[model samples]
Every structure is written in structure tokens, then in C-alpha cells.
Target: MQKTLEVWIMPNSPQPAEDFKALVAPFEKAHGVEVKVTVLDWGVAWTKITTAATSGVGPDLTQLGTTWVGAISAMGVLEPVDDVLEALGGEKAYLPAVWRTTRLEGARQATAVPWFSELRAFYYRTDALKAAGVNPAEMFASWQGFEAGLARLKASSFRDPETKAPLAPLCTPGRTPRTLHNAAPWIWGAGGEIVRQAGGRWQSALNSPESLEGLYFFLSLAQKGYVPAESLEKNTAQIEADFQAGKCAVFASGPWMIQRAQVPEAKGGFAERTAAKNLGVAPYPAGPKGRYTFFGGSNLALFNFSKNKPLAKELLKYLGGPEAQVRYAQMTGMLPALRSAWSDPSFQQNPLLRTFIQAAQFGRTYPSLAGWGGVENLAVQHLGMAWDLVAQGRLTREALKDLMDKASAAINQALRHHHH
Candidate 1:
């Protein structure tokens, strides 16, 4: 007999609870579980999740940001869901990059279920690139080509009819959670990493020479005026709006963004500016070490304290099933975690959507270590401060190095502390 089940999910959309309830309706009827979805705002979701994780009481299942899984799983409170994962068709059913986020490093069993996924790529303005006399192929070919193309875009005389300002070369968030994500490809391009374990101890890789090279190059986009210096103050929302307005030429975003650009402004899209027609997608330029793009998304997890875990596992399996993945992903603009879900025509029909399919092959993910959350927060603060300085026109290479050095040192200490 299945008992009522509670599920907690942070709002991915304005009406996540309503949308989820509709999605789960058939499962509730089939399984006899009265599933209840509690909506949590992302701003306070972390606090609520930690409270539930520690108190040994919470919804039977909850959705987690892929990164947060590392920290919460370490609490030993979530049930290991490998069997459930297998029941849902195992690791092969999901994107490798998305799968990597479901467990701690070196663990065998999945502690969470890979739900939907997202991968990042640069979205450029076709009109601007044409006006600049730049080829998309050359622009996305490598780091040097990408920068040179941006410089050309900046130097071009193409101006917005209303704003009368040339399209800014690029728009990227200098601060916000995106700060590190925006910086990651560059670090990887330069053959740098964030952290590594040696002799069973985790050490910071953030300050390594290679990583420094990547970080320096990424910030220099703003410094060299390829991206507007004022972009330092803009977060993801503003940049998307700026991009929609043709105030900016290109910016990095994901699949969810593609259709949004095509919709009319009254429908919360950029069609008025012809942003949709000008839109184009390209994988990140091949970095020196390798080509990579940020790949991640949310996961579903069951708490160990559930009274009807067998039924809960069934719910997990059902939600992760291909049909649910496609339907739910369509509603929220998330890519399905299930490979079978990609076979759906909605994902297959659009050339822009298909670009994401090809892009996934080059996707990379954050390390799945338990101590990662702390390290990430520290990196954000230090690197984010560097961005703040860049905006102020006072960040020196020496000062930037100093900030990263402190970030690495702090990460090393936190890793050691987490170990003990």
C-alpha cells in the first residue's frame, strides 16, 4: 500500500508546483500515492534543504541543483538510489555530464536521479557578425579566433537604430553564480582545473599557472573592451535582456533560451528587436587543452526517512521515465536527462535545438567531491571580487593573481578541514 508522498522542488518556473502536479497526475493514479509538491524559492531553498537533510525529516523526494548534491549526500541522510537508477535504466539512460553530478567522487551508487539537463554555448547575433565581416566558423574555431572576431565586432560601425550605440561585442555576467561557470571553459582551455586530490588530500588547482592563464584571458574580454565594462554589474537576467535588445552582440546561454528569443516581447521574448532572426549558436571555441562547455542540471533524490520508500522509488522511476522527461522538459525548456527523451521530435526538429545535441558530446562537469560546495563558494567570492575590480578599472594582473592565490589557499584549507 502506498502512503502519501511529499516532494520538494525549488521553483524552476513560476508555477513549478502546479506544473509538477499535472505531470505526476498519471503516476499518482497508477501507483495510488497522493504526491504533494511543495514549491521552494531558490533564494531560501538551500536553507530549507539543509534543515530537512539534517533533521531526518522532509519530503520523500526532493529536487536538487546538481552541484548541491555533493554537499547534501555527504550528510548520509539521502537514500542510495542505484537500484532505482537501474530500474530507471541505469547510467546509460542519462547524459554522462549530467550523470556525473548524481554522486560523490569515487562512489559507486547514485545518490540522486538525473532529471533534466542544460548545456552552455555562445549565442551570437548573425546580423552583427555579418556586419563585422566575420565568419561564424572562424570565430568558434579557437580562443585566438574568438577574441579576434569579437574585436572586429566591436570595431564595426553597426549601430542600434534606437540606442545609436554599436552592439557591444559580448555580454557576460561578471558576478553571480555564472561567474565561475563563465570562467570554467577558459580555465579548462588553458589546461587548468579547480581542485585535485593527492595522497588522499584535496588541494586547490584554481591558482595553477594554466588556470591562471585561462582566468586572465576570460577577464581580459572586459578589460580589452570586447565586452562592455559596465557588464561587470549585470547579472544573467540583465545580460539576457541586453542581448534581447541588441545592445549586446553575443552571450553564453542554454537550450531554454532558444525559443524564448523567437517569441514576441509581449510573450517575454525578443522578437521586436529581431533578436530571433539574428540568433545563432556555437559551441565554445576549442581551448588549448581541449574543447568544452558547461553541462549540468537538476537531480531528484529520495530522503532515507521515507515511510513508503518502495512506492517512492516507483515515483522516482516514473518521473525519470522518458515520457515524463520529455513532457516536463518541454514545459520548462530543460533538456531531458533520458537519452530516449532526445528521440522526441521536439528536440529533433529545430536546427538550433540540434546544436545542443552535438554540443553535449563536448560537455564537461564539476568534480563530484563532497567538499566541492565550500570550495565553489570561496572561488566565487574571490573571483567575483576580481570582477568587481575590473568594473572599477583598478584590477591589476598582480592584484588578480593575489586574489586567486588567496582563493586557492582558502580552498586547500577547507578541503583539509572537510577531510578531518
Candidate 2:
């Protein structure tokens, strides 16, 4: 009898499916197993899988977020991959920090291996930065200093494209998460943490005075008119559009932004006007906590119901291998989760890859929980409320505490609900 593996995928970017196809083709030829791959839009990928798990109709193998491990594993839908980790030469082969995520419930019961690592970085306009008296080489020192530079641009009246008026410098709402994510480097730079765990006890650290100061400083740009008002709705696409159109002086983004420059649709004319060398990359500014970035990306896992468990594990191992890592990174412009794979010459030589490398090495991943999306949405909404208060000139240090307390209470409730 012929065996097949049904793998769920998300076409979130332009390259994963194509790159994965090539990677898995060899596995099929070598093992004589037929692989059935189902690709879905990211918008519904989570939903589809969640439903499948409940209905007993999900695939044998799937690509999931590292954070999702807590949620789905809680539901008892995923098989523990500890044996797989042992097969990979245990934790020493991977990055130490990343290896920690594998053991969620306990050290012996790890859910998933970290598959991809991504983080927030600077994507500035080279010409604009130089024109504004900013030096790229010394650009990344501290988050506070970076903000002041943006303020300088905001105050200066650069020539506008349409009316030739003094158009101020700005960052778009696109990748605005940078305010939160990139803030990590600042917090860690300041020796702070959003949360901390010691001796198996976890507590909220984001509410401390130091964290509050860092949070306020990180968010002050948008509150003070350094970032554009229109950014409230637009995401990275809008940021990229604004930069490409020469409407903004600087922007913050990640390696995925590189894809926008290659495509002909949106930024084509903008890229040409900028001499096709429009972007200047930099690590996020450091802070008292040392330097850190927000980590994200995807993960691969074997389903408990998968008939091709052995084959799927082989595919996962191969995909996480060095050669496949290079191909995926080159093809998709995203970073690989494997530490050794990242050291490959192909990845190291890419100019933009360095932006991710610096951030990934010292960066941190978000707290993984079943209620992650809800907590994230709530935090953003309340933070947004604070954004409004700042506009009303009502945002103050005291106001932050109240806002955070309320938000944390809600988040804690949700976490408790998910816990039991």
C-alpha cells in the first residue's frame, strides 16, 4: 500500500511553497512516499486547522507558528516531538534561547522545535538619512537617539513631491508593531523584561517603572507626530508605499520588505525613482536592557493522525537542514530558525540579512499561550486608546499605569480561562 502525507501550508509569503516543494521532492524520491500538500491563505490557515483538529479532519503534517504550540498542544491535537529533537542531536545543535521554547509544559515534554526566526529592523531611506545629516554607520546606538533623529526630520521642511511644500519626515503605521516589538532592544538594553520566569514562577514585569518608562519612550514617536497620522490604518504595505512614493523620509520594516522592491506592481515606479537602491538597513536602537528584537516566523510539526509520521519527520529534518535553509532564505527573504543554517555564507552575505541577524541573535520571542491573539489584540486596542489620549494631551505617566492595569487584568482573565 502507498502512503501519503497531507501537509497544511500558508502562502503567507511568495516563496515558502515553491521552496518547500523542491525540498520535499527529494524526500519523496528517496522514500517512495506520496506527499499531499494543501496551501491556504494565512487569514484562514489558523481557523482551518483549529476546526480540523476539533473535527478530526486536519492533515498529517502542518506548518504552524511556534506560539501556536501551546494552544494546539493544550487541545491534545499534536504529538510531542521530543523523540524528533533527540534525533537532531538534542538542544546543543540549535540556538540555546530557541531550544528553551521547545519545552513548554516541562523540559521532558517539548512540543515543537523552533523553525524560523524573524525580527523587526530599520528600513530607512538612504538618501533621506544622508540629506538629514544622519550617518548609517553610527545609526544604531540607542532607541532614544533614533527617535530624536526622526524628530529632526519631522521638524525640517523637506521639499514635497506634488506641491513642493516642506514635507516632513515620518514613519507609517505599517510595521508600527516596531514601537512594541523593536522596543524590546530598548527594554533589554535597559535591563528590563515584559515578563520573567525564575524557579518555575512567572510574573508580569511590564508594569514596573523602568518598563513603563521604556514603553512610553518607545511609543512617544507616534504620540508626538514623528510618525504620520495616516499610519493608524495602513500596515507595512502602506509604509512601503509611502517610502516608495517618496512621501516619507524613513520607515521601519523587516527582510520581507525586500520582496516589495522586487515585485513590479506597487513599488516599481518608486523603486526606480530611488535609483533601485532606496533602502538603508539598521538594527533597532539599543536600550538599558541590552539589545533585543521581536521574534516571529513559522514552524513545522507532525500531526498525531499523520500516517506518514516517519516520512514527515524526515521532511521536517531536511527542511530545517542547512541547504534547504539557504534556499528558503534566498527565495523568500525570510530567516531560518536553525542557528547553524543562518551561518551559511549565502545568508550571511545578503546585505539585508544582517538586519535580521543582529536582531535575531539578541532578540526575544513573544510569550506563547493559547490566548495569544486575544491578548495581543487587547493590548493593541488599549495602547491605541492611550494613543488617542496622547492626542487629547491627556496621556501621562499615571494614565499609562491605569491603562496597563486594566489591560493586564483583562489579559490575565483570558489566560486563566485558557489555563483551565
Candidate 3:
């Protein structure tokens, strides 16, 4: 008994259609179900989904961001997936960390499946590190070690002989989502949390002594002569290039990045960076908190108005199964959300992937409170703006603290409102 299922997706990424086709092909063949998929650009697609959610008119299944499951589930329009997870097999077969993303109040599921995930890691120049007799692996275990390695690179004149200066010590830019998501690793590593959800309210733990310590530590790295003056000019790509060119000893980035570093066509001869014995990868050094990575990834969600609920479930089950997960990762250069995928010899053998798998499991996601985004925007904007102002000698720590207090108060106040 074959059924036609309408599967909706946003063609935001170039590979979505082909990737979805490959993912759904095997399932469709196995179950004798026909999948009708509509691909819309992200904004248009979200508009369609939101309207469908509100008016009860949309496809049976949709590709979704991991963060949306909790908020969407809270609306009371969709069903949970707990029973589906049990029917599929249970925790023994799935990655428990991946499962946690779907565990939101009022939205607990089988409603969402963590399709893929990624984490931050140190991408550095091996030539500079080894020349200084530093093991990139062990050098980032503590703030002291990371600073020492960068200081050495800065002192030793590791840049191209013609450039006449040390390469960028750290390269970063201020921007949306990535600005906060990327900053999270250091924040958590320093033993601080953005905020933790409490009784349906978001709390501002960032004002804690631990939080200030972490913020000051990272801000110090930028204040000192470690990060490039042009650090904010280049995003991760420029940093990646500087590393491959032996211009930097340390850079922060995620696993999918290896593709950019290793692909000849992608990096303009960066294959010489990590693969040809010139670059190395490793975990971030632990701060007092003993190491942490921020979680980032996407999920698969089903719409409540789908006419083919049962078939949509079938499609979801197959899409998230180990077979599809591995294939999807291979196809899209994404990390799989299943623990079993990491144990594969190929995945384990890749130095970066091995490190990333461990980090993703230990990595913590930021609080899902809707206001958390606003808080991060406010916090980072203030920190960055204040940092610039202080560099120009226009702001002081006490003044910044007052600004942070005001932002925190505003966030907590809004949290209380959203709480009810």
C-alpha cells in the first residue's frame, strides 16, 4: 500500500534538493510511498510553514532548524514523537545528546529529529606550532596554554619571511548568530553559562563572578597583541587562509571547515595546510570549567496539517535511521547525529572528525528561552562596543558593568513576562 506524502523543504542551500532526494530515495523504495516535495527559499518556506501551523494548512513533513522544535511544539499544533522513538528502537540505537534537542516542554517528541550537528575546534598552523615545539593538541587545555602558544607565535616571527610580522594570533569578526554561537565555546570553557532555564523563566547568570572571569579572559586575548588588528575584517575563511599560509598559530572554527581546508578547488591550494603535514587540529584548551563546545545543527520536523501523517512518520523514521544519517553526512559534509556513525573507521580515522565527535557529545546547547537570542544580541553588542570604546579610552569596566546590569535587568524582566 503505497501513499503519496508531501514533504516541504527550503531550498536555502544549494544541495538541499539532491540531498533530500538521496535521503528519501531508499525509504520511498522500501515503503512503496511517493514523496511530493516543494522547495521554497528559506524565508518564503518559513512563512508557508508558519501559516500552515496557524491555519492548519501545510505539508506532512518539513526540514527544520534544531532550535525551532521547542518553540513550535509549545504552540500545541503538533504531536510529540516519544511513541515514535520507542517504535523506532529507543536510546540504545540513537545518540542521546542528539535526542536532547527534541526534549522541550510541551513539545517532547518524535516530532523533531536532529539530522546533523557540528562543533567548534582549534584550526592552527602546524609549521608555526611545531617550529616553536608546541603541540597544538596539548597547548589549548588552559587559557594560559592557549595564550602562551599565541604569544610564542607572536614573538618568534613565524609569518612569511617577507611579511615581516607574526601572523594573526586570533582571527574573528563581529556578526550575527556566528558571533554568539562561536563565542560560546570560550564562554563555557571559562566555566560560565549564558543563562539557564528555570521554571519557565530565563535567568541572567552572566553577571556571576565566573561569567565575568570568562568574559575578561577572552577580552584580554583581544586586548593584548595576540589577535590581528584586522581580526574583525576576516571571518573564519580569512582566518583559515592565514592558518594554512602559516600566518597564524590558532583559529576557532567547526568541523565542516576541514572540507574547505582540504579541498584543492575550495582553498586555492590549502591541501598543503592540514593534510600535507603543515596543519594540525585539536580540542580547545580547558579553562577552570574543564573544556566545552557550543552545539549547532539542524533537525527534521513534521507539520501538523499533513494529510499523510503515517507516511510522513515513515519518511522521518527512515531519514533519521543510521543508514540515512551516515549517507547524509557523507553527501553533505555534515557530522552525523548518531553515536554509531562516529565509530565508523573512516569517521574515527579523520583527526578533526574524531575530535569533533567527542566535543559535540560534551558540548552544551544554550538555553532555549526565546529571550536568550535577545539577551545574546544585547550582551555581545555591549561587550564589543565597549571593547572598542575602551580601546579608544572612552569606556571603563565599571561603566560596562552598569550597561550589562541594565541589559540583564531588561532581559530578566522580559523573561518574567514570557514566563507567564
Candidate 4:
């Protein structure tokens, strides 16, 4: 009798569903095994996955966020993939940074296989910067320089085609959790962490002077009018649309934006009005400590309850292997998790793709604690409230600092409670 593998995929887009079917076609044919794939909406994926895990009714293999591994693995719902790693040529086969995510906190077992990866970078308009008289090489060298450049763009009087008003120099999603990724570089660059494990304890360090400084600068963007007041109501998708429509001078986005530029119907939902060459990519601006940005993407995992563990492992190997990684990169503009795949000369010479590849080496992710997800939700709420206050001019700088302190305390309490 032929065996079958049930796989749950997190839907990044309609393309991933099609690409996945293509990805597993050969493996299915070779093994004479049936492969069943299910795509889940990201909004409901967490709840759905967790429910299935607890009820012991999940698919044999699943796609999950790198950060989600720790929580799910801790629940003992994920199958350890140590044997799979050895069979696939070990950790040397994949990007070291990406591979590190598979090992959850306090667990020696590898719970997930890194699939595709993404790193944050600044996507700016060449024409807008030139019109503002700012040098691309120097604009993001420092935080102050970046702000000064935004001021210049603000003064340039560039009007939005739709609104016919001055365009925002920068586009940000102040009210949504999307702000976390866009603003993370500022915090990390300023030497602050969302949560850290020190002396065998989990602590929230967001109240530090270094972190507060970064938080102030990020909030100041909207407070000082560099970003429009309307940004407080927008999400990342909305901001991306504004950037595509030439209503913003700069946008903080991941590699997928490259796809958006080429395929008008992608994320921003519109084609580039100007030449694609005008889309310039830059490293996130540096701070006193260094430059850092949000490192994110999903991973492939085998469920502990899977009856077809052996066949599932075989499928996982192919999906995370070099050939599949390259094919996936070609199908979508996403960066592959396999290190050897980057050696391709095509990726080496692409200026836009190169920026993300370089940034991936230095990217930082959310703490891999089992309960870090809960802490993140609390942090997002506090930070979102602070941004709203500052942007609305309802809070003073001192008041904002106090708010940060309160948020830090609450987060620390959450961390300690979770840790215990």
C-alpha cells in the first residue's frame, strides 16, 4: 500500500500554494507516496495550529514561523529532527543564522527546518532622494543623517498624485504590530533588546537609556511631521501601497517588495509607475551600537503525532534542500535559506537582492523563549499606545519615557511569570 503525507502550509500568497505543489511533485512521484497539502491564512494559522497540536489532530508536516518553534516544541507537539539533520548533511548545509532558529530555547533537539528567509532593509525612491538633494550613500549612514534627509524631502514639496498634498517623507505603520518589524532596527541598533536571558533569568530591557533613545527617534518620525499623521491608522500593507504609488519617499520592507515592483498585482497591488530601476535598496540606518533589523520567515516541521514519520522526513529533506530552495527563489523573489544557494552568480550581482543577502547575515530575531509570543503581544500593545500618544502630541518626551518604563516593567513581569 502507498503511504501519504499530510502537510499544512502557511499561506504567504497564492503563489506559495502553487509553488509547493510543484516542489513536492517529484518527491511524490519517486516515492510512490501521496502528498496532501493544505494552505492556512496567517491570521488564523497560530490558533488553528495550536488547537490541532493540543487535540492531536494536526497534519504530518507544517509550515510555521521561526519564533513559533520554541512554543510549539516546548509543548512536545513537534517531532525532533536530529536524525533528519544528520541525513541532510548537518547544519553546514543551510545559512547558519537561519538554521539557528530550528533549535528552540533549552532544547538540544532541532524542531524545525529553515525554509525561506527574509531580512528588513530600506526601500527608497531614487528620484525622490535626488529631488531632495540627498546622497544615497550618506543618507542612511546615521540616524541623524536619515532624519535630515527626510526633512529635505519634506521641504521639497513633492505632492501625492491622489491627495495633491505634500507627500510623506517616510511611510510607517504606527498603529499595527507591523511597526515592530519596521522599528526593530532602531531598538537593536541603540543596544536595546525586547527581552533577554541573563543570569538564568528572562528580563525586559526596553527601559534602558539606549533603548529609550531609539524609541524616541522612531516615534519622533511621526511626531515631527516627517511621516504623515494619517500613518497612525495605517498597516504595513497600506504603507506599502503608498510607497508604490509614489506618495512616500522611503519604505522599510523585505525582499518581497522586489516581487511587488515586477508584478504589479503582488502586495502593493499596483505596478510601478516609474522604471523598476528607480527602486533602490539600502541597509537599515546605523546607530551608536550597530545596525540590526527584524529577521523573519517560516520553517518546515514534522508533527510528533504523524503516523508517517519516515516518509514525512523524506519530504522535509527535499523541501529544505538546495534544488528546492533555488526553485522556490526563482518562483518567488524570497531569499532561500540554504547557504549554498546564495553562491549562484545571479544573486551575487543583483544589487537589490544583494542588500537583503548582506542584511540576513546580521539580522536579529525575537527571543526564542516558549512564551516570548505572549510577551511580544504585550510589548506591541504598549509600544503602539506610546506611538499613538507621541504622534498625537498628547504626551511629552518625559511622559513618553515614563510610559516606556511602565511598559518595561509590565513586560518583565510577564517574562518572569512565563519563565516560572
Candidate 5:
């Protein structure tokens, strides 16, 4: 009997469905399997999949954020695919950090197969840096140096030559749903963690002195006038949009931003801009304790409700191969999870892409805790409150400590709630 596989993925390019069709064509041909694909915008994908998880009804295969693996796996709707990992050459075939997210904390069975490696890096407009009398290579040597660089850029009073947009020295989000990807590194770099196992239970580390120090520094960027005050109200998407328009001098973004720029300039891409030509990428600056970047990416999870289980595994196996990794990851501007995929000359040919690929070595990810989804929710709200205080110039160390103390209390409750 012929088999059909239903699949879902988030938009990774200008034309996601069309692009996915071309990428998956070879798999279809090899397995003689018919495939159906759906595009889920990252914004609302959570509810859709969470909805699917509880209802036990959805596509046979779906792409989800690696961080979601533990939470969704706890729902018991994901099929453990350890054999799939083995078939794909196990952890040896993929980036070490990305591979670590394939299962929940303390679980032996794999619930997700990592698809890509997404790590945040600093992107700056080179000419703008030069105009500010800052050398690109020397821009982010240390935390103090980075701040001085931004201050210098702000002093240059540079504007995008074509669009005439005033270039802000930096653009980091406030009030956005997910900040850990950008914020946690600051904390981790300060030798702190957001949450950890203590007293035989999971609890918040936000109130710890180390965490508060890092978080204070992160939020104080707005007060320091490095981050644009106007940009504080925007989401990450809008911030990237601002960056593409040459409105930002420096920003931290993932690989998809590189892919987004590959689109034609008419469709909101910066490909034709001088900014694209002079783009500079680097890992985060060294903090007091260490230099680190947030590690995250997508994973392919097989739902237990699928009727095409046998055929779907075949599709998963095909995706695990290097060819699929090279093609899909490149088109989407993500680093392939498969380590060998980096050997693709195209990756080496582009300096921006190559920079991110190298920085994957410094990637660090969230702990694979089942209650992490809930932890993220509580943290976003209170942290957002801190961000607001920051924008208003009201966030003193004392206020930050009080805010984080509350954050820790709420987080501890959620963690304990999930423990049993």
C-alpha cells in the first residue's frame, strides 16, 4: 500500500511551503512516499502543537523548537525515536550542544531529533563601526569594550545612506515573549543560572546575586542609552526589521536573519544594501566570568497519533542525512545539526554564515526540564516588568533584586508543581 506523510514546519524562508517542497522532493522520490506539508508561523505554533498534543491529532511529523521537547514530551504524545537517532549515527553525527536537547532531563528515550543549531551572535554594520572609529575585530573584546563601542557608534551620529534612517547603537527587545536566548547569556556569562536543582528540588536562581548582577547589566543597556529607547517597545521581529532597514548599528540575532537577508531587497530584504555587504558577525563579548551565546534550534518530533508511523520514520531518517541537512539548513540560514554538513563549500564561501558556524562551539542551552515552558512564561512577565522599569530609569539594584525575588518565588512554585 502507498503511504502519505503529514508534516509541519515554521516559515524559514520567504516561501516556506514552496521551499520545503523542493527540499523534500528527494525524500519523496527515494521512499516512494507522498508528503503533505504545512507552514506554522512561529508566533502561534505553540498553541497549535500544544493543542495537537492533548487532542492526539495532528501531522505525523512536525518541527518544534528544541526547548519545547521536554514540555511536550511530558504530555506523552511524542514517540520516543532513539532508534532513529541510532540510525542517523547517534550523537556523533550532530553538533554536541544541539544533540543534547533530543530528550528530556534524565530520560533515556529520545523524543526529538535536532534539526538545526541556532545560536545568537552580534551583527554590526561595518562602515558604521569604522565611521565611529571602532575596528570591527576589536569591537566586542570584553563587556566594557562593547559598551564603549556602542557609545562611540552613538556619538558618530550615523544614518543609513540610502534610507536616511538614524542608526541606533543597539536594538535588544523588552516586553517580548522570549528573552532568555538573548538575556541568559548575560547571566550565564556572569556565572549564574536562571534555575537549578537545589535541596532535592528545582528552584529559581534569579534572585541569586550572580543572576541579579548579570540581569541588571543587561537591562541597564537601555538606561545607558546603548539600546534605542524607542525600540524597547518592539518585538524581536520588529527589531530585526529595523535592523534590515539600517536602523540599527549592532544587534544580536540568529542564523535565520542571514537567510532573511538573502531574499530580494524589494521584499523587505537588505541584500542590496551596503549593510549586507559590510555585515560583521561575532560571538558575544566576554563577560566578567566567561563568553557565551544562547543555544537553540528546531527539532523534528513524531507524534504518537500518526497512522503512517513506519513511513514517517523513513522520512525522519532521510532528514537526518547530510544532503537534507545541507540543503534545508542553508536555504533557511541555520547551521545544520549534522557536523559534516559544514563542509559544504557554500557555507565556507560566505563569511557571515561561516562566523555563526564557528560560534556554535560556544553555544549553551536551557536545562531540559519539563516545567521550563511554565518557567519561561513566569519569567517573561516579571522580567518584562523589570524592562519597563529600565525604560523609565527606575530600575535600581534594589528594585531589580526585589523584582527577581518575586520572580524566583513564582518560578519555585511552578517548578515544584511540575515535580510531582
Candidate 6:
């Protein structure tokens, strides 16, 4: 009987799964191995992966979100890739930002292999901005200028034809964890740290004055009525729907929107009127201190439970290589993980994609803390509370300091517990 390899993945989309099967066909034939693939739901993936990792009954190779690498690798279930990475052409084979996610907790071994990656950026309606007398150059200059441009958009009488209601200057989710993810760059761009280790201890720096400054700027958009008053109830899909319906001028998200926006309205996509050329993509406006965007992506990881480590490593190398990375990118609209993939003329000359590639140069990921999951839960509770208060016109800049202080204390407590 031929040996078998079990693989699991969190499918970014259905197409990627089919693409994966096709991409690995030759490998299965050449190695005389049967590969079984399982697609897991994103919401429950962490729970399932962690359970398997701890129980010693997981797939030979699996996909992991970059942020999840640190915590999971620390569990000691992951097979280190120091040798595999060296064999795959060392650290320089991948993009710089993509490479960083593979090295967490200051360990020398690569915990994960860079795969498809995403970066958040501003996706705006160019025609609407021009009508509001807002130039792209000015809006991209600084956060202050970006705010002014949003105000101009709000002031204009541009309305969605369907409902004849005024359009929002900025479209974003407010109630979901995604809200925090979208705001992370603002916190960093303002010279603030979410949480940093100093004096050999994990501590929450989210309450720093710089962080508060950025938080205020982000919330002020809603408080000032530039975004919808009911934003707190909206999620990313809701915001995307509004953007597609012509009720929003600017929004932030990953490259997937390029493909998503073109689906027919009957299939829950935009109308033909709002297709490709109507939109423009740009990096988030520079904050007072610097430019930053959240870096997110899937990584290929090996499990200690695998019976066929050598074959699994070969599969991982192929997936992380330029050939597979480029094909995956072409299939899923994801940015390739390999640096060499970017040199292709088709990728190099794409204007829409260039925005993300450029932003990746300044990309930042969440801190690699094992306790970060707990801290993030606390963030959703505390920061979500802050957002609600501000949305309801009950929170003040001075009042926020107290809320953050309390939240930081709670977050620090969680970190200390995890530290031991």
C-alpha cells in the first residue's frame, strides 16, 4: 500500500482548493503517495488545529495564519524548518515582510513557510472623490489631509441612486474583531505599541498617549458623522455592500475586493455600474508619525505527528516556491509569498496590485506573544466598549484615558498569567 499524507487548509476561497489539487497532482504521481486534503472553516480553524496539535492527531502538513504561528509553535507541536528552509534557498527566497512571520519568539528555526499574504489599503471611489474636490495626492499625504478629504466627501451631496441617501466618507466595520484589526495600523503609525516586552515582561502599551491620539483620530470620523451613525452594527460584508452600492467613498481592505466587487448583484456582488475601472487603490494615508498596515497571510506548517516528514517537507517546499506561489496568487488574487514571483513582468506592471506590494514594504504584524490571544480578547471587550461609547457620543478624549488604563491593567494581568 502507498503511504498517505493528510493536509488541512483554511481556504481563502473555493478556487484555491481546486487550484491546490491541480498544483499537487504531479507530486502525488511522482512520489507514489496519496494526499488527502481537508478544508476547514476559518472561524473554527484555531480550535480544531490547536486540539489536534495537543492531542497528537493532526495532519502532516497544515495551513496557519501568521499571527497564530507564535502561540502554536510555542506549544512544541510544530516541526522546525531550519533545514527545510535552508534547502529551499534560505531566508532571502521570500519577501522581507513575509519572511518575518516565520521567525517568532526570537527562535532561530523557521516555524512556518510563507504562503499567500494580504495587506490592508484604502479602496476609494475616484469619481466621487473628484466630485468632492478631493485630490488623491492630498488625501494620501497625511492623516489630517485624509480627514479633510473625507469631510469634503461628506459635505458633498453625492447620493446612492437606489435609496437617494447621502454616501459615507469612510466605510468600516465597528462591532467585529475586524474593527480592531483595521485600526491596528493607526495605532502603530502614531508611534504607539499595542503591547511590547520591556524589562523582560509582557505589558500592554496600547494605553500610551500616542496610541490614544491615533485612536481618537479613528473614532472621530464616526463621532463627526463622516461614517454612518449605525456603524457599530456593521461588519466588513455590510461595509463592502455599501461600497458596492455607491453609498461609500472610501474603505479599507485586502486585495480580494478586486475579485469580489465584480460578481453580479444576483450573486451578492456589485452591479455592473461599479466594476473595475470605477475604483482606485492606495495605501492608507500616512499617519502623523509614519505609514503602517496590518500584515496577514497563511503559512505552511509541519506537525510532529506526521509519519512522512520527508515527503511533507517536499510538498511544503513546492508550495512555498515561486512556481506554486505565483500560481496560487493568480488563482486567488492573493499576493505571492516568494520574492522572485514579484519580478514577473505581469506582476510588476499591475497598478492595482502595486499598492499592496508597496504597502507590504511598510507592513506590520501583531506582536508575537503567546498570550496575545488573551490580550486580543480583552481588546475586543475594552476597545469595542470604547468604540461604542464614542459612537454613542458618550466618550470624551480625556475619558478614554481612564478606559484604556483599566483595559491595559486587565491585559497585563492576562499576559502575566500566560508568562508563567
Runs of candidate 3 with Cα error greater than 4 angstroms are 10-14, 38-48, 87-89, 92-97, 105-110, 161-165, 197-200, 233-238, 241-246, 266-269, 272-277, 370-380, 383-400
Clashes by residue pair, model 4? none
* Minimal lDDT window, size 10, model 1: 269-278
Q: Rank the candidates by TM-score, best first.
A: 1, 6, 5, 4, 2, 3
TM per model?
A: 0.96, 0.87, 0.87, 0.93, 0.93, 0.94
Ranking by lDDT: 1, 5, 6, 4, 2, 3
| Model 1: number of backbone collisions | 0
| Candidate 6 lDDT | 0.80
1-420: candidate 3 lDDT, tens digit per residue: 677887777652347777787678877888888787788785566567667788887778776656555556655666556655665567765555467666554233556766777667777767777767676756776788888877777676465443455666666554333566665666687776667654755677666567667666665666677765566545656665566665666777777666656667454545544323555677767888767766657777777667766777777777777787777777666777666776877688887778777666666676444344456666676566545643444444566566557756766765666531
lDDT of each: 0.85, 0.66, 0.65, 0.79, 0.84, 0.80
Clashes of each: 0, 14, 6, 0, 0, 0
List candidate 6 stretches off by more than 4 Å.
15-17, 161-163, 266-271, 275-277
Candidate 2 per-residue lDDT over residues 367-398, each given as its tens digit? 66556665665556666666666545566788
lDDT of 4 by residue, 239-321 (tens): 88778776788878888787667765544445546525468988888888998767778888898899988889988888887
Which candidate leads the pack in lDDT?
A: 1
Worst 10 residues of 3 by lDDT: 267-276
> 149, model 2: CA deviation in Å?
1.7
Query: How does candidate 5 score on lDDT?
Result: 0.84
lDDT of 4 at 81: 91
Candidate 1 local lDDT, residue 289: 91
How many clashing pairs in candidate 5? Answer: 0
For candidate 5, the 10 contiguous residues with the lowest summed lDDT are 259-268
